[PDB]
């Protein structure tokens, strides 16, 4: 339409952790608009051009001893150092989920406001597992350090039927079981 | 791609010519730990647990963003003034908990695939704008170097209020109203 | 108690 012109620049200093502190990897990304043109990979140890737009940057950054040494050391001063603070805060955050069944013929099991992301939801009709008519949304990120997931079950409810939703989460010692009975 | 148990963006740096505007933030597993108010020179953590034990000097963000401003001018000339491509944003509206008539809740408007990172996100209670109870997050990064933004609206569920999330973006032809 | 850092952005070639 009548959109103004815009030029975007991004820089991302990303750390990848595995096996606690055993495996650490640093990848800094220099992005013009949405094109990553240069990067530093700690597994490589030098800057590399990603597109024809960053040979001048990679050659200059690799020729400057101060830049390459500072970037090489950031695997310890940034990734490993800040991870020790994650062990004491983020990696210990446990928020237990709230499980609710709502009729919609569809039956929706809502699992809301939990952290971390690992979650397990299963449907049962009279203690027998249901899989054929089960839809689950992807993990919904609320953006406030809590997650959400919706698991729906297509049902033809009879009399005496007891539909249950079984939920497992790392913050729970036992699974949460919520029942639902037709009226 | 890179396989890892935990991914942290210790430096989501952003600077664009429209404004001009910038943003600095740290992320861990897709969630925002803090952002630095570049105008106030202040670190704003996103959880009480972070404000208690964690510290970050806002001067580091002002120093990095000043470099991105210098780098942007250099790559603009090198690319023969190649402008950014406006993408089509995807909007989704939902509640943080199952809405029970009479119990306070919160509506969540997820604006995904935002590029360039310039967007207007506002709510509408009926056909009129809302001011109280509206808050949003910072531009959160994606692996494809686009962004997504989340806006929140606290509300009291009633049988007569039908809410809308109006999103304005250059990749759209008209303001997108997603209904709830 | 101790300030943590981010990644340092390296400068481009332009003067």
């Amino acid at each position: 339409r009548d959109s103004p012109e815009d030029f975007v620049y991004q820089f991302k200093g990303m750390c990848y952790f595995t096996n606690g502190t055993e495996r650490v990897r640093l990848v800094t990304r220099y992005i013009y608009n949405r094109e990553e043109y240069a990067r530093f990979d700690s597994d490589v140890g030098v800057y590399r051009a990603v597109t024809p737009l960053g040979p001048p940057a990679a050659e200059y950054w690799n020729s400057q001893k101060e830049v390459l040494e500072r970037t090489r050391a950031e695997l310890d001063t940034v990734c490993r150092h800040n991870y020790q603070l994650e062990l004491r805060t983020t990696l210990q955050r446990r928020v237990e989920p709230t499980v609710t069944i709502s009729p919609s013929n569809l039956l929706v099991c809502s699992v809301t406001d939990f952290y971390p992301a690992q979650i397990k939801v299963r449907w049962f009709r009279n203690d027998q597992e249901e899989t054929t008519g089960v839809v689950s949304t992807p993990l919904i990120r609320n953006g406030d350090w809590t997650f959400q997931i919706l698991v729906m079950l297509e049902m033809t409810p009879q009399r005496g039927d007891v539909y249950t939703c079984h939920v497992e989460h790392p913050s729970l010692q036992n699974p949460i079981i919520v029942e639902w009975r037709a009226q | 791609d890179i396989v890892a148990d935990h991914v942290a963006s210790y430096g989501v740096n952003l600077y664009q010519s429209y404004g001009p505007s910038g943003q600095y933030s740290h992320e861990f597993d897709g969630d925002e730990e803090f952002y630095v108010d570049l105008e106030r020179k202040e670190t704003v953590w996103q959880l009480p647990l972070f404000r208690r034990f964690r510290r970050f000097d806002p001067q580091f963000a002002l120093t990095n963003i000043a470099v991105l401003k210098h780098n942007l001018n250099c790559v603009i000339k090198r690319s023969n003034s190649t402008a950014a491509t406006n993408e089509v944003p995807e909007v989704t509206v939902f509640s943080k908990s199952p809405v029970t008539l009479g119990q306070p809740n919160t509506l969540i408007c997820l604006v995904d695939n935002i590029f360039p990172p310039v967007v207007n996100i506002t709510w509408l209670s009926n056909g009129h704008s809302v001011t109280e109870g509206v808050s949003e997050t910072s531009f959160l990064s994606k692996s494809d170097h686009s962004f997504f933004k989340i806006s929140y609206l606290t509300f009291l569920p009633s049988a007569d209020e039908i809410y809308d999330c109006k999103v304005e973006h250059w990749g759209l032809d008209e303001p997108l109203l997603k209904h709830w | 108690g101790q300030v943590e850092l981010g990644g340092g952005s390296s400068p481009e070639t332009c003067i």
Partner: T-cell receptor, first 109, second 110 residues
């Protein structure tokens, strides 16, 4: 600041000068920097390091394993080495430098 | 490496001065400090890409500027007796090791 040094120190010319520096509250993302300033001059950069040992043409820097202290080794003290030596810390994040009292080294022949 | 002009300076109260600094060839960051026997090494401001990036706690009468070739100037207006000091210039490639110049020894008299 974060570093403490002896205010004065003597050394014989031609021998090695070991200058101590204590910094128990140093962080893991902070480098140890060493500067010196001859009278009526500006500060001269000497050496810096993060962990353990670093050397150059001017001196050697040995940081202990726990990083709570470090030593600046001047291999063969000369008359020109008579100056005030500053042991400081820095994040190398483009921020200001902070100097302390420093050690007034006197090289006596 | 780093050069500063002038080397020495004599001024009276109320006057102004302009101190110049040329960083090491290739360096983009220029820092200004004030060194006194009483207060030590006090930071003024740091410039990168013709813009002030870091700011100290000195009043508004202490101002600086950086040019296209990374050379930097520093101005002190309505000088005071307590402004007598060695004004040092430190150059850095961008954020790493800072290399100081000889400095300008300023003396303010009545």
């Amino acid at each position: 600041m974060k570093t403490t040094q002896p205010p004065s120190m003597d050394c014989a010319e031609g021998r090695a000068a070991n200058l101590p520096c204590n910094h128990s509250t140093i962080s893991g993302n902070e480098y140890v920097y060493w500067y010196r300033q001859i009278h009526s001059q500006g500060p001269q950069y000497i050496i810096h390091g993060l962990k353990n040992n670093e050397t150059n043409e001017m001196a050697s820097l040995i940081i202990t394993e726990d990083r709570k202290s470090s030593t600046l080794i001047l291999p063969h003290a000369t008359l020109r080495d008579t100056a005030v030596y500053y042991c400081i810390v820095s994040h190398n994040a483009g921020n200001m430098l902070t100097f302390g009292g420093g050690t007034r080294l006197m090289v006596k022949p | 490496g780093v050069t500063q002009t002038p080397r020495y300076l004599i001024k009276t109260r109320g006057q102004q001065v302009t101190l110049s600094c040329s960083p090491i060839s290739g360096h983009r960051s220029v820092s200004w400090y004030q060194q006194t026997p009483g207060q030590g090494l006090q930071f003024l401001f740091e410039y990168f890409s013709e813009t002030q990036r870091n700011k100290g706690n000195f009043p508004g009468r202490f101002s600086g500027r950086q040019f296209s070739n990374s050379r930097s100037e520093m101005n002190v207006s309505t000088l005071e007796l307590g402004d007598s000091a060695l004004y040092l210039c430190a150059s850095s490639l961008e954020r790493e090791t800072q290399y100081f110049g000889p400095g300008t020894r300023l003396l303010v008299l009545e």
